[PDB]
């Protein structure tokens, strides 16, 4: 499986700050066995695609489902494609847990984005209370199932496990924990979909990853990459890529 | 002095470079009169593209924004971002935001204050729904909406008010030019009563009801109508005719 690194550029964006990042990425080495995706704020997808080296892909942070009037609402897959992005991030923790996007809405979005010919980074994760309460497997699995129900071809899908307790709470993950949760994901895919799908499908980690903690996580047999939050905005993002 | 005629195009669409670029091309090629202030509000995804094709004379607006932010960057575009992308206006309180996405009067006020703080112009939308109008409360509803905006405005220099007769949009009710003038006249009066004579005389109040190439000139002739917030016609060639009303 090709190693997969995504950068979730959640920020109060500017052409100057974004430009600097891009210049840095453009000058950076992308290892040959690696696929890199950057997701700017929506206003900057076009700008980013224009400045970024084609070696690096662009993702939208979100999209809407089949549109129903209401254009002031979210960017459509058509727009995302039009602006030259080839991926979308869906079910990201912030959308799930701050903005209240439903499991069903996410599944609908995945289906729509895929139909419109985008790649999908589909995000799942348990909350802390859930972690402690021994319902992590049940929670991620149900989340995955709804995403899975909306995927015909997995070739353009990447799963991102984001244990929420790894944003905004006081607890930390380890290469061990990542493997456990990650290993289980593949098993669900193997029984539920296919062994071929389970083998080829990248499962990336989205807990808070830093240049400090990236290498051990990468070494795990079932961690195929990262969905990076704050670190994506830093020079250490390059270290993460490598 | 006379209020400068103001025309905004509310480009609510599933946007494309090709269609948008063509529309901008048409505007660039048109003889936009010096005496008309023209503003185009594309989808967010196209907040930097238009400003890269449209004529400098033409001004770009965001369709919405957020108030003070905290985390949650995936949320609405900020005023800083809008400015950064070269837009100098934002449309706030648009009926679609109020009546479909449920934006509160309070939220709109916070947005107005923040947008102005950050150096943007504001197109502030007000208007009454059909039940409100039937119940005889048109003035009450629009005055209250206007009060909320007003409470968040210090300098009116960079504000334009747009009256949207929500009651006559998608309902089967038709607003007559006479009806539009009545609402516009009342709103100016509120400004006079509640802010200043100078503000009342100087503030553009633009019409956000259905306007077309065939109807623009009669509407523009109304004494208290300072221009338009153009919806669907703004995506069409007759948008130039409207500009020239």
DSSP strand content of chain A: 15-25%
- SSE-based structural type of chain A: alpha/beta
Distance between the termini of chain A: 15 Å
Number of β-strand runs of chain A: 8
Q: What is the count of DSSP helices of chain A, taking H or I runs of 4+ residues?
A: 11
Oligomer, anyone?
Answer: homodimer
Catalytic activity (chain B): D-glyceraldehyde 3-phosphate = dihydroxyacetone phosphate; dihydroxyacetone phosphate = methylglyoxal + phosphate
Modified residues (N6-methyllysine) (chain B): 192
Pfam families (chain B): TIM (PF00121)
Subunit structure (chain B): Homodimer.
Explain what this protein looks like in three dimensions:
2 copies of one chain form a homodimer. With 242 residues, chain A is α/β, with parallel strands linked by helices. Chain A has one domain: TIM Barrel, CATH 3.20.20.70. The first copy, chain A, is 41% helix and 16% strand. Chain A is built from 11 helices and 8 strands. Chain A has helices at 15-27, 45-51, 77-82, 93-97, 103-115, 128-132, 136-149, 175-192, 195-200, 214-219, 236-241, and strands spanning 3-8, 34-39, 56-60, 87-90, 119-124, 157-161, 203-205, 225-228. An 8-stranded parallel sheet of chain A has the order 7-6-5-4-3-2-1-8. In chain A, strand 1, helix 1 and strand 2 form a beta-alpha-beta unit. In chain A, helix 7 packs across helix 8. The radius of gyration of chain A is 17 Å and the shape is globular.
């Amino acid at each position: 499986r090709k190693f997969f690194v995504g950068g979730n550029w959640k920020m109060d964006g500017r052409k100057q700050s974004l430009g600097e990042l891009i210049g840095t990425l453009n000058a950076a080495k992308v290892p040959a066995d690696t696929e890199v995706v950057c997701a700017p704020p929506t206003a900057y997808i076009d700008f980013a695609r224009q400045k970024l080296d084609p070696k690096i892909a662009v993702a939208a942070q979100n999209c809407y489902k089949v549109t129903n009037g209401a254009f002031t609402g979210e960017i459509s897959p058509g727009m995302i494609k039009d602006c030259g992005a080839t991926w979308v991030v869906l079910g990201h923790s912030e959308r799930r847990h701050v903005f209240g996007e439903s499991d069903e809405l996410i599944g609908q979005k995945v289906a729509h984005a895929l139909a419109e010919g985008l790649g999908v980074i589909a995000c799942i994760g348990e909350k802390l209370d859930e972690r402690e309460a021994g319902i992590t497997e049940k929670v991620v699995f149900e989340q995955t199932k709804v995403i899975a129900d909306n995927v015909k071809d997995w070739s353009k899908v990447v799963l991102a496990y984001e244990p929420v307790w790894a944003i905004g709470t006081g607890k930390t993950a380890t290469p061990q924990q990542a493997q456990e949760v990650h290993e289980k994901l593949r098993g669900w895919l193997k029984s539920n979909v296919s062994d071929a799908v389970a083998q080829s499908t990248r499962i990336i980690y989205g807990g808070s990853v830093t240049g400090a903690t990236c290498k051990e996580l990468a070494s795990q047999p079932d961690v195929d990459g990262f969905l990076v939050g704050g670190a994506s905005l830093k020079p250490e993002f390059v270290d993460i890529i490598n």
